Amino acid sequence: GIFPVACADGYGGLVTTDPKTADPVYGKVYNPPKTNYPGRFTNLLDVAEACPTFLRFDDGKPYVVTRADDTRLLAKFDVSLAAKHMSNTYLSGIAQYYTQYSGTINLHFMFTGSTDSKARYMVAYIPPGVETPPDTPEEAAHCIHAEWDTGLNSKFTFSIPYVSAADYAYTASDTAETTNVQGWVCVYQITHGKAENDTLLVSASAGKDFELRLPIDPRTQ
Amino acid sequence: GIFPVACADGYGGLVTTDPKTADPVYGKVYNPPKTNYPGRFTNLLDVAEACPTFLRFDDGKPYVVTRADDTRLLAKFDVSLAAKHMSNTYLSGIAQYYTQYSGTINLHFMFTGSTDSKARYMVAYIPPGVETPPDTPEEAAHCIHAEWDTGLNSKFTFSIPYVSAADYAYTASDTAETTNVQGWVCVYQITHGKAENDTLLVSASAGKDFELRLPIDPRTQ
Amino acid sequence: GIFPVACADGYGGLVTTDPKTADPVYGKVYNPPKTNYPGRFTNLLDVAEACPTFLRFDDGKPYVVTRADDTRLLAKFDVSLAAKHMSNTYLSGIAQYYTQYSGTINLHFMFTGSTDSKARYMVAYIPPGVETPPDTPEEAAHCIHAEWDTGLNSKFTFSIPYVSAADYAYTASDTAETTNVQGWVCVYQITHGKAENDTLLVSASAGKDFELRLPIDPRTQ
Amino acid sequence: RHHTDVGFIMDRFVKINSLSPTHVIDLMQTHKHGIVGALLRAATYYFSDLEIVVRHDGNLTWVPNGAPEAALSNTSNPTAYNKAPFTRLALPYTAPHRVLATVYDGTTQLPASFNYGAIQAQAIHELLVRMKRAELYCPRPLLAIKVTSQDRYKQKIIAPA
Amino acid sequence: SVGVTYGYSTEEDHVAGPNTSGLETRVVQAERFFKKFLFDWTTDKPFGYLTKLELPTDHHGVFGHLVDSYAYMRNGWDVEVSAVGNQFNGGCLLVAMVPEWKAFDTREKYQLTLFPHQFISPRTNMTAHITVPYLGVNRYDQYKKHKPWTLVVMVLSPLTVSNTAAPQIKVYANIAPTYVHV
């Protein structure tokens, strides 16, 4: 009364991604349920929302050298997913273990001078291929820009729209072309009020949109 | 009309813990049901509740040498799950076949002098690391202690709370550190009334709490 | 879309007792239903109820030499499941293919003299280990006994209770001890009336109780 | 409390020392400190079903108790044939008694009753045995390792590096 | 007294049953107490001094008549132990109901009380009292070849004396089967 042994012709590989399971052996063992313990989480993303980050400039000093005089250009960095401006960065490491990624990106700003001091600044996006960085607030504005002041607020969070070629992109960058993937998106300012020595901070973080597809080791394990 | 023979890639080990079963052969055979036979049980624990035990001191004499004079210190033993004080002990052997164990531990006391004789004694716990055994009832008491008398009762059962590092511990002890795992938990007394020669007995047993996790042979089978 | 091929690790032996079946090949063939044919049966036991048997004595003559004079002892045989008294015996052969057996055993008696002749006889059990066969009806009786006469009946069937060590026993007997397994259970009589030459017959058979467990060849196939 | 109800403890295996072209089968054949029999020996009366495993050659073959040994190879009372390398069978109880036990003081050799039996072949190496649904009755005394040195006891423990 | 303490159960039992039970019914008059000598016990014996007593000895009783009758049988067992003294003694003896007795060894001594039991000291008890319901390999038994039980006592405390007491004590016990079926 055998059932037809519809044997397997060549499948069933002991391989990586698999969802197959196993047999408990010294099994049938409880544990005190670990609910109500603090520090629970699931998402690298979501925990990367409430937590901001920092940045870096060649001066190795995380904060921004913030000259306060007739100068107009502040400083210009880049935002890849992997760039000297953004190595030591809670996103990238989490990022660099991936290839596909999508969605908006976050930033922050923290002021330094005494509140009394009036001020002006201007965040500004630049698309990868304008062929020339802007050199004046209003013509910079043509791409993307906004404002704030010392007045009525000190913090701020900003975002660049997830422009790309396709609705996704490569995490690492290529050694087969030239054009920067994003640009040199950075900040302008109107007349400094007064300061003996300012300073600026800046971060990035996950928000409504920071997403990924996935995954492989790059490193030399 | 074969069913897809989704063959097995590398599983199904003839190994130890397994729950798999077999095929009766000269089978289909009854037996007179063995109910109503006495002496039924299931639990090493539970049968280790109603049954007390004994102990041992270097005198190889199970009972306690119970000097009856101006002395204050009675004698001091230890209670591991494996210790010279507690080898020949219905728990340990059952225990020594395990590694994880938890829950309170039991004791007993049986008096020897004639009932008329007044008496005083004081059980007392000591935590593993007080760095000094107590030397007076009231300062001993600071850890844990209690009383009774010859009066109105002769038996007694006592318990130490299952203090530990974690909510479990190792059965065998280590050869990598010094501090005793439990202490030297033992007994004091107030003025002996009168006795030409006393004697004390003492046991251990399972109770509401004596538990285990499990198991491996240690021995040299 | 393979189903997980939960392959077999080491089972499935082509072995003896098995209940597994096969595949008809030149199959799908009827037969004229064999009901209403006579001689149907199922049970070696049950067919061994209505059928009695015979016995044997060293005289090779199945019937009993039945001396008719002042003698008191009639003759003494044994009833094993395998004994010279009971070889040529529809039970034993059926029996000797087994090891475990249980339940009462049957006998018969058939008289020979003319009905007019008064008579007396006394069946009697003896337990294996009385250490002495009885030598008088009433003291024989102490174990088990009963009566009948020529009067009002000529046939009779008798039984020994299935005494043993355990509620079962070995069919074959041992070559490691001495004591007979059952005894020498046989018959007494009160004064013979008159006869020039008697004769007795005797059988065994299955009844309510003759049972077995099972089975192996002994023989030298 | 979720152990020391035998129903989980005595469903493993245990090595047996001896063999021969024939070989009796019994529990007390086990080692008297293998964790299997300790509990077993720790009791008076026990019953179970039975499962056994044998790595072997030729033709493994088995008979229940109360049988003339002299008649095994012939006529092959039940069995299935050779197949390497694992082979797993289970026998149901057969003994003439409604329960087993460990030791039976009668005027100290083990009795000739409690007999799961024996198996026979032409080449026999390895033995695995197994207890099913078992139960035990009137637990008996039991020992631990003996104490020789001073403190409590000492023993090596595994650990990484 | 501490009162009866049962072995494994406390209940009125099945008394009438099948063919052999029908053939080996509850012969009640087979029952009668008597006394056995146990042992001596003075300040001499240190701990571990075992003293065993196999069961059951011969006895000029109707029971004793049948226990030679050399036949399938079953039985019960009721134990009542004591040793008269006086309230100035001191110590602790151990009474023991052993199934399938075997020659013990020093280490296991410290285990006895697995079995049903009481304590023996002139304060708490003056009357041990213990009953084992039947058991055995067969549904019945035939003694001579075997002994399913024994009644053993051994030291559990050294024994003390003053001038007021009696420097020697004898120890009796009560042995009589019950619930007999033959």
UniProtKB/Swiss-Prot annotation, chain D:
What domain of life does the native source organism fall in? Viruses
Give the location in the cell: Virion; Host cytoplasm
Q: List every stretch annotated Antigenic epitope.
A: 38-46
What is the recorded function of this protein according to its Swiss-Prot or TrEMBL entry?
Forms an icosahedral capsid of pseudo T=3 symmetry with capsid proteins VP2 and VP3. The capsid is composed of 60 copies of each capsid protein organized in the form of twelve pentamers and encloses the viral positive strand RNA genome. Mediates cell entry by attachment to an integrin receptor, usually host ITGAV/ITGB6. In addition, targets host MAVS to suppress type I IFN pathway. Upon acidifcation in the endosome, dissociates into pentamers.
Give additional notes from the record: Contains the main antigenic determinants of the virion; therefore, changes in its sequence must be responsible for the high antigenic variability of the virus.
Q: How does it assemble?
A: Interacts (via R-G-D motif) with host ITGAV/ITGB6. Interacts with host MAVS; this interaction inhibits binding of host TRAF3 to MAVS, thereby suppressing interferon-mediated responses.
- Name listed for the protein in its UniProt record: Capsid protein VP1
Organism in which the protein naturally occurs: Foot-and-mouth disease virus (strain A10/Holland/1961 serotype A) (FMDV)
* Complete-protein stretch covered: 752 to 933 of 2332
